[PDB]
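Holo prediction. Input below; ligand is guanosine-5'-diphosphate.
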Amino acid sequence: SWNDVFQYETNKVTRIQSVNYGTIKWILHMTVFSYVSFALMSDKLYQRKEPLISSVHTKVKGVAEVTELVHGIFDTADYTLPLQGNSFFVMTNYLKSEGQEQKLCPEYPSRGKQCHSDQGCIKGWMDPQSKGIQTGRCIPYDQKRKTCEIFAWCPAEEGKEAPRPALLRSAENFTVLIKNNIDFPGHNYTTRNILPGMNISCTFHKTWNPQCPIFRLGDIFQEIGENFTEVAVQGGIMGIEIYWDCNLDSWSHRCQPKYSFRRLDDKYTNESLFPGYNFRYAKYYKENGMEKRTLIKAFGVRFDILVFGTGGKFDIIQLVVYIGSTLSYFGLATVCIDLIINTYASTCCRSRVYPSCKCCEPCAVNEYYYRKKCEPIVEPKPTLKYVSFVDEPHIWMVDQQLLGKSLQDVKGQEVPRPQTDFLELSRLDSPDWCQCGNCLPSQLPENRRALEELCCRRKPGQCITTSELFSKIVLSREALQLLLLYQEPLLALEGEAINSKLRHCAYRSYATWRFVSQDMADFAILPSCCRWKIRKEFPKTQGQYSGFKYPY
Amino acid sequence: SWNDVFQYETNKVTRIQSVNYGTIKWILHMTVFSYVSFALMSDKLYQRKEPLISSVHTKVKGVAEVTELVHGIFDTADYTLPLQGNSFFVMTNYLKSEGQEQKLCPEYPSRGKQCHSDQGCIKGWMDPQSKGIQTGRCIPYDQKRKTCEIFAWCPAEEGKEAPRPALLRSAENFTVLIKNNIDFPGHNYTTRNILPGMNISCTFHKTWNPQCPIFRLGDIFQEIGENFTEVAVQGGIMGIEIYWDCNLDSWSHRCQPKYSFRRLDDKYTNESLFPGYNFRYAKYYKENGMEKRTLIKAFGVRFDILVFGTGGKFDIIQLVVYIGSTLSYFGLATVCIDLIINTYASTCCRSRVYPSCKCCEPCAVNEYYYRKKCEPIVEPKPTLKYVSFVDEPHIWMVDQQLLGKSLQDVKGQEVPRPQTDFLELSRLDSPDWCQCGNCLPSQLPENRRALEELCCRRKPGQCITTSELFSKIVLSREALQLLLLYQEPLLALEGEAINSKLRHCAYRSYATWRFVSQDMADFAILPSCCRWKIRKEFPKTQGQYSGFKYPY
Amino acid sequence: SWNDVFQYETNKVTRIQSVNYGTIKWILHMTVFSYVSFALMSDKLYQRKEPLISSVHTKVKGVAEVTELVHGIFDTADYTLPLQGNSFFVMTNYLKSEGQEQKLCPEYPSRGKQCHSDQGCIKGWMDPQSKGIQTGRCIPYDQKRKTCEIFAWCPAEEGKEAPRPALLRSAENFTVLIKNNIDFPGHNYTTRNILPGMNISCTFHKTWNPQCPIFRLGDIFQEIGENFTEVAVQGGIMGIEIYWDCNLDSWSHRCQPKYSFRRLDDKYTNESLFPGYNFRYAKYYKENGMEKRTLIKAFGVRFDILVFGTGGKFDIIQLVVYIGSTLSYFGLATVCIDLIINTYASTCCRSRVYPSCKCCEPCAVNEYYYRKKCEPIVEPKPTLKYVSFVDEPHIWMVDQQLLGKSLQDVKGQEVPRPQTDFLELSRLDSPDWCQCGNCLPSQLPENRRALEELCCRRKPGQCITTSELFSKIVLSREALQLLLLYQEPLLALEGEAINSKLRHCAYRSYATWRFVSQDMADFAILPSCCRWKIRKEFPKTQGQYSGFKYPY
Ligand SMILES: Nc1nc2c(ncn2[C@@H]2O[C@H](COP(=O)(O)OP(=O)(O)O)[C@@H](O)[C@H]2O)c(=O)[nH]1
Ligand SMILES: Nc1nc2c(ncn2[C@@H]2O[C@H](COP(=O)(O)OP(=O)(O)O)[C@@H](O)[C@H]2O)c(=O)[nH]1
Ligand SMILES: Nc1nc2c(ncn2[C@@H]2O[C@H](COP(=O)(O)OP(=O)(O)O)[C@@H](O)[C@H]2O)c(=O)[nH]1
Ligand SMILES: [Zn+2]
Ligand SMILES: [Zn+2]
Ligand SMILES: [Zn+2]
Ligand SMILES: [Zn+2]
Ligand SMILES: [Zn+2]
Ligand SMILES: [Zn+2]
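Structure of the complex:
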């Protein structure tokens, strides 16, 4: 319990002393570190970002003189609405109509709205274009043309084109002072666009005076290539963008506004979609006991102040999350070099690639790395068997069911014989499937008999048992007794169990000798000749030999 | 230095040829990859997202005719304020009061505000409800009821209920054209909701014409199940939501507005919390040398245009961060299969689980995988000792202090004897704690004597030294000499150092034979019988035997 | 193909039974888990956050009485603009000017704008400060001073200071009711700041009544330490911040507003930058056939309602991304303990650190862990050679080109001789560079001769070949024959190939004996004495000895 949680597991590793792999690893590590640092610093991913809340206060300055003969002056109480926040309006043109009473009168002829006769007109129809209700009559607007008769404020001048050139062109010489107060409430920071010690006699310039909050309207239009004289005729919408890219860290504090301009209304608006910008405003006051009204259609530019931006401040959680996101990228060197080792250890490299390209020859050392790095094993299953023929240099793995066919004729995968422990070695008639002649028929049941139908060689020749090594290793009683006493020093050498143990040790001795690996010697199957020679050397009394058994 | 940084470390691995584990690994890999790809594509986590900046320009079209007998017409200069941005107001009802002068007069009787007598009223009290100052008198408002006397604009009509049905119901037939210009300044993209080639004679429909920016107000109310006729009596607030879900990538560019509607005022507002929407506006003009005023309480619907949304564009840093965040999820297959291997290699599986369920039987192969994967080691500490009794099949680890008690009676953990290197083996009176009789008392100091008080067996019987293997392996002088000359071929076989080396080699020979692992043979303790037989075979001259020493 | 994808690779590990390392691992795991959980819960990183869309409806209540003698009352139609959204204005002071006609008249003397003579004035100059056009004359404004003569609305009172104390001070006793409707459209949630069952007779207090949406203006000023009486003289801008920190999860639902106040205009604005807040508004109506105008300069406080906040709701993708970002932090225990193992296994620890500090002594066990964890290997390259001198206890690695110099005099890195497999061992004239006398000159070509110019010892003495172990291991014909028949039991012992194999086995036998590791024995170079003794024991017929060959 306690000893199970008081454990630490660490990976077994191979440390390769390689110039190429070391330099590749360090180059990849430096590349990953450089990119991660660059992404962290350029994007400021260690910071929490917060949008601002903004308040705008505008002040327009400028007066204009207009003739018609009546000479008048327009000041901020004339061309400017009480709007002093995000939007302000400057009038650049106007149309006047005095003395309007709600009564029947002909509509203004605009865009060919002339009425030929009462048939061309329609009674009881609401007309938003003329802002009246047609009575179905056709009275002459003028001595030449006739228009529909509407009940509305009269006289009506709807559809009259705006004066050209614009009357209040001098509005391009007006200036606006903009005061912008911004706040980041999450970061608990506030600031404004006008600081103490700032020059007040300046006007904004994108290069000379980029922080002066006083803007000449004509300069605003000239900056983005717009014609104030042309826009003044019908009006439009212009946007003054204030951008706050604010760094709220003490060591890199920077919170200044950036001013830009952008036309917000479509220059190519369809004629039916009301191009430009205007509004009709009226003063109402009855006279002679009759409701009167004076109407002015004012054209001008609406200015929208768009204030946006974010403020960033160092946050530990953001940095931790970013570092955790980038941590897995430092396995790139491992992935790349392991891919190099695995790829160049394949046999297809030496067979096909190396003869073609001799530059790839010194990279055959990856087979050594692969065999010092990976240990291939197979699943121990009931059908797993290993055979080895003395007339062959390799070993066969049979990993399929035997459907009565003898194990001799069954084919399997070719696996190589592992190299032995040379450190220790440095010390001082016959059946149809039998190609050696010493094999004997199996005494196992029929359905299992094919398991024991194996020969020591695939081709006719001498038997493995004929060699002196078979007697020295497998059949030597003294060697087997010493091996058995190594494990159990005080073993009782009496009874029939000693012969059973001796048979087991002879089988193992043979499996170890022919199948070097203990993983393969466990599932190795002895040929009939060796098996029956062993059983003739150590016979059992009153029983039947069990044969190979599954070690799991 | 340079050779220390020019190294590469790679993990040692075991490659298991398993159908089950391979298919599980690939299924888990595919599941993780599928979910990661789905999360990346559906949420567009490879994109940087930016909120928009918006500009709105509205145009209301519609005229109404109202009787009272005076017949009048209302156009955009009557029912519409100069607001043409995010909000516009449409008047649906009104109350009129002409000829107001600042003087004493009775308050309007509303919600039972009748005054019984001067006691019920109060002098010198500001009354925001009646918008006046009470003088403490109680004059009759009418021939029947009496109300408090206030100094304010007179005549006063505060508290008068709005007309029902609403006078300007026809405002439901009005239309509004909305022009919306949006910008993503970080992505440097701009667009508008009206494009060239768009039909202008349409009206918005959620299915037939979902991109027409012309909205009929009654249709707006009908879309969300609101009654324009009922809302028109007292007014309200309606929101036109413009949503921009914009994809700014070239291969998947899509930036269109989506229009929705939502009532913004509470339908069930408390009567004291001013339900509906209205405002009082007045025209001031003196007459007869006295300040006069005409007041209109206008009820109507305020429309708030709410424009919101984000624009996304592909960003390499976002993709890198997301991929780094998802990289660690590809260790799921390793975690799961390692848990399977570790869990099924426990002995509790075979003892308890396998007899109950026979389907779990073929999964006993995880013990082989575990023993081919993990190598358990223990911390080398001064109290670490190993003992092995010839009458027992296992080994005992003593990992605690000996408080004078003999090592024979001290209990320890049962560890198994590791399998030997069978590849190499295939070649050609007595003390009270002594159960064999050949043990001798220790000559070490008392406080350390208990270290050497160990017997070869826990039960009475034959001694380990009696076996011939003890003479062949431990006591054979020729074997020890050959072993010593293996390490040092030109060793000088003279002096008393040769006997010391021979004793050391005999101890090691015995430890290796009984404790197969070199990790366990280092801390193994020889029993007294073997130790003293060795020391009688190779005695030392003029000294005391040091005994077991800590190899670290 | 199919058997290549049906594989699973698992890491080989060492399980250390250590109290220190286990407790360190679990402490680090718990620390990482605790911090990750705290960061997830405190920052709610499992949630998708969305900004709100807001609608504001304000209602101001309050009336004031002002003397001048004319006694008047101001209600919401007097001091309040039709603004009922994010901003509303309350008038706190005013200046009046009646009967204005567009004509020539002297400018008001403000800030020393007196005109000494016509020289001091200028003709044809637009003056935004006085809102007129100077005609270049100098007429007396009063009997004492003279000012410039401008064509504008007359009489002009520009530059007149605001009345002190403020006329509408009682506006501090006014109240505003704020209705705020907020929506999260991505989360499909909507709410408002007034809920059913909320008291209506309350007023806001930051502690007693923090959810009452009725605010007294004087209380707003007192909360942030502002003086309403002083601000009322010239006006200002105040911000009512509504903050919505809304949790939209069912188990932790919380969506309430938080109210704060902040002055939005600069208290220390420069006199030339228009401090305070005011606007000039005029009523136009002609009289006596002449255009007249009444102008009022109104000073007051503009209130900006700033509504901001985010709503968060549980999102599975956010949680998955956060967990993936934090997953790599659980390798901290592995990194730390591996660093501990690697650091304390260095030899500099025992040589320098341990003698100084005896507390670091029990931590010398990390050498055992390091050698059970890491296997150092080197790149097999053509210049890789190993030598071992019998008069030395170590082995020399030569990893550089031999430029004709004999291998005996070439220096290399000192590598230690690995420990043998003691489990198996427990069983039963001369050239100038020759220091033993049995070496012979090499028969290889000159450019390669230096490869074979190696001696068995660096100092004069006995030769390695003189030992009996050389005959038993290397020169024993029977041992070599048994070793050869171990690999090939049916080998044909005929021809000259048997002597070649015997020479190869003798070289290997010697390399294994002197260079224990097979990785080092492959590149080991035999000294001339041993090589020529072997070749005299097994000479070849009609050929030249090839010598050492690169095994790759
Ligand atoms: N690897 C392997 N083991 C074998 C083979 N034949 C028998 N054995 C082992 O020998 C034991 C059976 O011995 P057996 O001849 O039946 O003696 P018995 O049990 O006394 O009749 C089993 O435990 C098997 O593991 C073989 O061909 N290959
Ligand atoms: N593993 C193990 N080693 C032992 C034991 N007894 C002695 N040794 C080793 O034998 C050496 C001491 O030999 P010793 O009998 O004192 O000979 P002396 O030094 O000449 O007196 C030490 O280095 C020990 O490592 C034992 O019971 N177990
Ligand atoms: N490791 C090692 N191998 C050697 C050395 N000398 C010879 N060999 C091996 O012995 C083989 C050459 O044997 P050689 O004496 O030329 O016999 P020959 O080919 O019949 O002339 C090569 O495959 C070498 O690998 C040596 O000094 N060190
Ligand atoms: Zn046969
Ligand atoms: Zn045979
Ligand atoms: Zn005893
Ligand atoms: Zn004994
Ligand atoms: Zn020599
Ligand atoms: Zn020599």
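The pocket of zinc ion (ligand 5) is lined by residues A 436, 438-439, 455-456, 463-465, 527, 529 (CB under 6 Å). That is the main takeaway for now.
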